[PDB]
Amino acid sequence: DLDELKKEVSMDDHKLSLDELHNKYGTDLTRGLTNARAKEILARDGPNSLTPPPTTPEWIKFCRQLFGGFSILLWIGAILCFLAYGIQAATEDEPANDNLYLGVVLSTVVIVTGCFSYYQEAKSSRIMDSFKNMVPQQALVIRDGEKSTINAEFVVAGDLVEVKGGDRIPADLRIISAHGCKVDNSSLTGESEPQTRSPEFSSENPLETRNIAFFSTNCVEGTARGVVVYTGDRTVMGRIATLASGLEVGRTPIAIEIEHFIHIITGVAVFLGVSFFILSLILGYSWLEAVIFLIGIIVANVPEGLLATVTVCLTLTAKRMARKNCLVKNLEAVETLGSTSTICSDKTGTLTQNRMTVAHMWFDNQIHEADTTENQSGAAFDKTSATWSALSRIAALCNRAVFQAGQDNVPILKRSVAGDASESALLKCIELCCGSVQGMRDRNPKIVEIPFNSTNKYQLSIHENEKSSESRYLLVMKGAPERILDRCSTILLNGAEEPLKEDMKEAFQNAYLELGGLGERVLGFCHFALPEDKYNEGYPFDADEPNFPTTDLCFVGLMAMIDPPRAAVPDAVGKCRSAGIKVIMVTGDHPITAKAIAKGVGIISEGNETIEDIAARLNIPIGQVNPRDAKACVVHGSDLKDLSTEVLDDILHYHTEIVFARTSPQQKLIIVEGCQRQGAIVAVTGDGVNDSPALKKADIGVAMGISGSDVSKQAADMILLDDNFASIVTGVEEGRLIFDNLKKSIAYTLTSNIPEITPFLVFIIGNVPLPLGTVTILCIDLGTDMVPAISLAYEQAESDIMKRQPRNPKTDKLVNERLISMAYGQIGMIQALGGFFSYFVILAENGFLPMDLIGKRVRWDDRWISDVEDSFGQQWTYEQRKIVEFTCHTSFFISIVVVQWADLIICKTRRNSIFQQGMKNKILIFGLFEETALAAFLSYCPGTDVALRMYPLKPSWWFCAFPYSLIIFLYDEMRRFIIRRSPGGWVEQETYY
């Protein structure tokens, strides 16, 4: 799978002859191949079917999730825990079990997290499968001089293949004979209109010539013949799909922030250990015990609920997205939208609707605009003049297309119409504001029609007049406005008729250039009442000689048409530009149309100008003007092929409104890379196969759901099942909102750390009874902390999020030193002091004053000293003093919950005050209530002192942590106050997360 030979732009053998072609692959132009020869080749190289994707089993996708995120930190934690239980078990028959529990718990936090993340990734895959539909297809091949329809998988290189309007081109063909055949090259090349396939050659580029049919394309109208030049995976879209499969994914931004988080967490772990190692050696301990102390401190610096909390956090935002029809296959792809700063979009199928619609109309010397939006939410065009009625009769009659049988259910715009795209657009507009055309057509019987001619350049027909008072004959004709203008002498103004003096002839010329400059295609409609005295009701006007007056007709008005953009396209582009997101158009369409759509959607702001526009406004050559005075630029693909790396960098560095036109799929990838070489996130939004390699390499691919291709749908990361484009705006908003909340939840789960390690440090250094047990830390680590941390995600915005610039990746991280200074430095310290207060209170009320506790650990833990004197002289047995230590653990845990109240409240808001935002978050309130109920339950249920070792507390001890909490609240409130009044000051660059 040579990628460099697949990265190259397609080459071909188009510029040849029919004899050279038949001489190279071997084939009879009039008899085709022989069946024996056909099978010899079929077996020689392989069926004409693309290779299936590389599959994967479900246990594999579950192992990936098990060894991921920070499941490594926890895997070792678990392994270390069971190692210590092994050694402790084989060494003594009476070892503590703080390790068999610590290890099965840690392990569960990893297995459970993997199951949840998994379930998510499977849910998305099923709905993805219910879309991959495949109805078998069969092609028409001519062998031994006979026509046969065989499965698409049996076509080989060399046989003759015939196509008919409505069928799909089986393989890459070389047209040999055509009969007004047109094909839809929208998915592969990106051409919105049907390009006619002619046996003659026209352009050096194989994608532009007409003598080649392509894979996955469809023949709109006409029939054609051709020799199969390319077959199987070796086809154009085969090499493209192969390129998509042989590319990388990338590395999500969110995954880099989490990696940096683990980096800092380990930094502080080895720091606390090497330091308490030198300190313990300064106190007289040996090297074996001191080494074991360095192990215990590193293990304590492991947030286990941070994994489950972060997973639930990410999972919550994805549901909000799925409620509005935005599905993500992975789980972290939910944040990439908010961090995006450059959106590369596609035109055909993404920015547009890929369907032709009547845009502007000319009548009564006045331009009228029609509604060209999917759901028909706009302005009508004043249907009160007689002119419009005559126009409806002209277009509705002189038109041969008709809705496809059985569409009585779909809407007027999304139904299937058999015919050209122009007659279809006209039929839809008439059926839209003029009622049923089928009755309008049966109301006037068509007598004689002369089909569109290459010489006449017009389409005319005569029908009877439904006027019950006028039995005359009506004649209507449509065609190019110039040809029709040369055939009139009257004008239907407001109903009456008038001559064609040069005043209205010039108004017609300016109208023609107005509709033409708009990138639209205009047509002219005229009609005339045939005198029933010279052509009675019985006379038959056979289409042979001049039976109708070609000239002296009555011109009614012009009718333009073009593919309009989707409803929320301009507003969404404006919203993205408002948020500081650079919008760059990248499409393989004609530049004359790309520039117009760009100006119409907001990419090229009205007023900005290109170098050619300046040369045209001044009437001077283009090589004289300076390119720095041009803000917007249109880069052609042909020119893009010959450009250096620095030139592309300068193109993106100096032009703010860029539009890349006539770019091949391979070139689309080069543009995305040119944006990433400089340092920023990219989101590619597309639909066809030409978009497959761009969505894969982009930081986040957005594929259309209904109008998208299966390859680009399988290679993307986000799917728009409703084809609505406003979802992009919703995504960029949610991506930010869920980011500031992760910051809050991390500072919350990190604040509780300090009051969890300090007891052991003072234990080894100061020699006092153990303040915080292991089964209590587990109760806080996975009990109290979680619900509140999960609730911190439901926090609304503080300021307008859709107003700030995109975050810089090289400077604004997710976890900086400003957070560590708060959680580890200021709040956690106060929480630890409060805990040590409740501790000393419990031991002083029972008999051990703070002066006699220093130096007691060695005898406090001896199992054979049944007489330990306290500050008053009482003798305490071993189990009696242990019961008090356990009650001190219970109250320490309750103190943690009490200080967590004020921590969850000061963590709710980052800058704003509580009296401003407000406690409108019901989940947070529920978190506080549940957090308290759980602590009371664990401390007063019969049987806890035998299972978990938590004894009941006396009512006066629950109030030992209240002052510390109030103080935490007041300190953080004044902290958030100086930041507001003093922007950019010390408190901001020192404590503003």
Place this chain on the structure above:
Amino acid sequence: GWKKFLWDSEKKEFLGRTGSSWFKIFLFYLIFYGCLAGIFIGTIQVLLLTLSDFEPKYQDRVAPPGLSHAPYAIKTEISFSISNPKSYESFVKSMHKLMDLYNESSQAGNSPFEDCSDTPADYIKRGDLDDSQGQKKACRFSRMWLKNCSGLDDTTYGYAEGKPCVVAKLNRIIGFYPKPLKNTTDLPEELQANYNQYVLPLRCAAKREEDREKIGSIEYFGLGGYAGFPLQYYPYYGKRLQKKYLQPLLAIQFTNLTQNMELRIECKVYGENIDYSEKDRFRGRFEVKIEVKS
């Protein structure tokens, strides 16, 4: 990267900041931590003011009282060879440490050791738990009372020829009055004889029914010759109000002990405000494993 974030010479920065930054941050942390320390200290001083010096506010975790012993046996096992002298040294050093506090030289003069009844007697109340009448007075407890286990005649206390002693002791509790069982028809078998009301009885036995035969003659030594604690040494007024206070002791000689075999001996005190616990094996009773292997 590696080098610049460590020390650049244009902005004169170390690790990231300049000299004035490290100073602003260090000064802030010093003031912050100083305030934290002062607040914690104030909240601890008010705690020193809340409690009383002559009496622990809560006395529910130490009741009833335990029963400790000397020597200091690890795992509650006393195993030693009658030949190798370096086998029972860890035991004798403890026994001696305990008895070394009852030396007559320590108990001298009128204070604060007053002479009490040589025969068990009733309680003695030296007033309330106040500082009004100064330091209270405690009864004297002579070493010699313990006849064959006193370290005055046979320093080793018995371990020298296969006859060990075990000095039992009741855990000191402030304001605790020991209450012995009454003479009513319901009383254990053992306790019937020598019902000295003023004496709290202590009686050892065998954990299993089999071991009975392998255990010989349990000879208890104590005040007045009884196997108990005289009620006159109660109650205890606490260290602050009764420094130089001695708690009664009871010696137990396990004469006629079978050789080369682990014997489980359970000793138990009896009384009203005495209750045992299936979890704490030292509350009221105690277990000892003796094996005089020779």
